Design a protein around this nucleic acid. Sequence first.
DNA 1: CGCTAGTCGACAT
DNA 2: TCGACTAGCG
Length: 345
Amino acid sequence: GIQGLLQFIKEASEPIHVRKYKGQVVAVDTYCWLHKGAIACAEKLAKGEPTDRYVGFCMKFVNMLLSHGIKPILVFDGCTLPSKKEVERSRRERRQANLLKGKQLLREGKVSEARECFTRSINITHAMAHKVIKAARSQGVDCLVAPYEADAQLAYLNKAGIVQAIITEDSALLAFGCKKVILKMDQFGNGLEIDQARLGMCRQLGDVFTEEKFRYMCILSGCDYLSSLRGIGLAKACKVLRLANNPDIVKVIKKIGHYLKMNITVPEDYINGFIRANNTFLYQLVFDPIKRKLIPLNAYEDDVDPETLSYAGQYVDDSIALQIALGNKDINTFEQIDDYNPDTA
DNA sequence: CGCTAGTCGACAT
DNA sequence: TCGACTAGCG
Ligand SMILES: [Ca+2]
Ligand SMILES: [K+]
């Protein structure tokens, strides 16, 4: 997710009800419900005590969608993307230390203080996601396990016309080139929709708004692939892109100080950090449900080299990708975990 | 004042 | 985690 992105675009959003998508297909960033559902049972979850509470939470939102005659597609995160293996590292350690403090430091005697820590040490495993897939499948709800980030997978589904909108809490999905995003949707269907169409109404990126620039803005402000330089946020990011004349972005990156009337040096490893991050947004591997084949979110254009795009997801045989997408294989060990058949009835 | 970058709550009762 | 909010510098 991009920090403070939603406030920034708070004007391109119309309050809606999910009802408008009756008869239509809607993709879901299931992680959001999984996390919210994991909060209610933070204790049981942290101490490794058995629980199914989070499953019933996701299904509550599923049933609401069905009751409105909406066809949901639950999408799940797949493999750890190398571009994020860096940031995930820092997050692995936070849950690591956070769990421990709460676990015994507040276990003895009083407990009120500790739970605040367990909620911050919540881990959404693949085991937890598989339970939700099982529950959804039994009710005829489609589930899809992204090769890597659900974010890319969701964006693709929306672009391909497979789904009419995406349900999530993450505004950053628009940077992946998705068309419609439903935020803050409650259990009753009340949501806050943001259409990419109303997103071009912005003039903070210059006279001509561009998806390309919006993406640069998000990266410069800082994201999961590349942290921002000290003192750079969305507003400053807009200024640079807004003021900058020259098309090559790398030329502009070293020019930011010149643009921002501010004095700062851009490290060489940062230059590459922006090149990778940008390519990750563009060409992150996703799964095409129709042709059942691994494809980059965006088709490789005039000049690229897929062989150098290892950080944006490594290719694997299409049969291996299908089995992961279906939920029939473990992400890490590729062991059998299910036998769902998509080609029946 | 704008703007970045740091705590706090989420669910459930 | 993730946004919503505040504090505190340019
Ligand atoms: Ca995500
Ligand atoms: K930042």
